[PDB]
């Protein structure tokens, strides 16, 4: 990414194979690079344990004449992440229809064997994966751009909580400031 602002936009095209993946990421809010520096990751990095559900909100920023459907799925922890939409839809998922309402919310449920999870997550306290796939594809009329973008928003539900204050590792100094 030569331009930093590109990091916030998920590309989308008009003509794509029938089933194709839009994006994929690990659900490690306090350790994954994606969520590391978000407003939620920064707060989490001051603690050691966390629990509760999360909200992922997606907004379509294409033309008003564009249309399409997307499948967003959450896969609990397992030995292998999903590779195709066929595997992906077996887990928790929602079908998103783009219309007058430009935003959809995927609520990631709290499914864990322990009451809490480590911010410095490991194999024992893994949390799963999140992926998005083309459900129908994007169709545009004549005289419109051939590409669009999507943005993702992250936040915590009303049952979220943290524990065990600690010092964050993102900030450090070598000499006394003057």
């Amino acid at each position: 990414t030569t331009d930093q602002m590109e990091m916030f936009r998920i590309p989308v095209t008009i003509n794509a194979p029938l089933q194709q993946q839009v994006f994929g990421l690990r659900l490690q809010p306090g350790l994954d690079s994606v969520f590391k520096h978000t407003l939620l990751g920064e707060i989490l990095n001051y603690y050691a344990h966390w629990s509760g559900s999360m909200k992922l909100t997606f907004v379509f920023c294409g033309s008003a004449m564009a249309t399409g459907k997307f499948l967003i799925a959450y896969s609990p922890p397992g030995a292998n992440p999903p590779k195709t939409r066929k595997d992906a839809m077996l887990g928790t998922h929602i079908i998103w229809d783009i219309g007058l309402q430009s935003s959809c919310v995927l609520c990631v449920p709290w499914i864990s064997q322990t009451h809490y999870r480590l911010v410095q997550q490991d194999e024992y306290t893994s949390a799963g994966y999140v992926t998005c796939w083309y459900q129908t594809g994007m169709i545009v009329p004549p005289g419109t751009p051939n590409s669009s973008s999507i943005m993702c928003f992250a936040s915590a539900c009303n049952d979220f909580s943290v524990r065990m204050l600690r010092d964050t590792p993102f900030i450090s100094q070598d000499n006394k400031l003057q």
Binding site: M65, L90, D97, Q101, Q135, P142
Partner: protein, 251 residues
């Protein structure tokens, strides 16, 4: 507004923003088997959220020359999630279904699709007299295509679209539960089918409960545009499913 609908089954949800209302079979909602109508003696198993959930089938391309497609159930879901496992491991089955078909296009496209569920859609062979294996009409989740001309190969079903492979007028299929997907005002169709059969339960591998058909009655058309085809996707979800007769697996 009544153009927005939301359906939640198990751990899956479907949201549509442009949609007509929902057709409910013959006015009957799916339900469990009563005690005064059952015949099997042993206790049934009612996997609930594990099996009553939405499954996405493969998607198809709608071209300018498409003629139609059909799917046969529950053979289509025979190898999907835990529903397939329960089908394999049990002798008897019973379940309703909810079918959601999706097709979206811009305001500059035109076309019309007929979505209909045909119970007991017995089909005739291409050559009158000869017979066919159980592969020319059902091979899993793959879709089978109608044909504009009269079929000639003796190993497959008669695919004449205007007869619908049943020897009846294609325009009279309106009698069955159905909906239309008109690109002007609609993007999806929703049908809820209760369990329809002459016996309380049945083997899900031996008998096809009903057939789903999608037929373009107004062929797709567009001009200019970079979009060359309109994908079509089908989603299904068993409802109030229960099984009985645990034997070994393997169908």
């Amino acid at each position: 507004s009544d153009r927005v609908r939301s359906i939640t089954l198990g751990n899956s949800t479907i949201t549509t923003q442009e949609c007509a209302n929902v057709v409910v079979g013959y006015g009957r909602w799916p339900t469990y088997l009563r005690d005064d109508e059952a015949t099997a003696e042993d206790q049934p198993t009612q996997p609930d959220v594990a099996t009553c959930r939405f499954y996405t089938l493969d998607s198809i391309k709608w071209e300018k020359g498409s003629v139609g497609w059909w799917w046969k159930f529950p053979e289509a879901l025979s190898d999907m999630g835990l529903f397939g496992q329960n089908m394999q491991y049990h002798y008897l089955g019973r379940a309703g279904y909810t079918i959601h078909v999706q097709c979206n296009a811009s305001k500059f496209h035109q076309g019309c699709l007929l979505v209909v569920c045909v119970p007991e859609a017995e089909m005739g062979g291409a050559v009158v007299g000869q017979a066919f294996s159980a592969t020319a009409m059902a091979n899993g989740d793959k879709a089978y295509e109608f044909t504009s001309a009269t079929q000639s190969d003796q190993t497959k079903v008669q695919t004449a679209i205007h007869n619908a492979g049943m020897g009846v007028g294609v325009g009279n299929l309106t009698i069955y539960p159905h909906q239309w997907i008109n690109l002007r005002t609609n993007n999806s169709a929703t049908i809820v089918m209760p369990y329809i059969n002459s016996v309380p339960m049945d083997n899900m591998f031996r008998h096809y409960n009903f057939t789903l058909m999608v037929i373009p009655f107004v062929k797709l058309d567009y001009a200019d545009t970079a979009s060359t085809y309109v994908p079509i996707t089908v989603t299904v979800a068993p409802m109030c499913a229960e099984y009985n007769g645990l034997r070994l697996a393997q169908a």
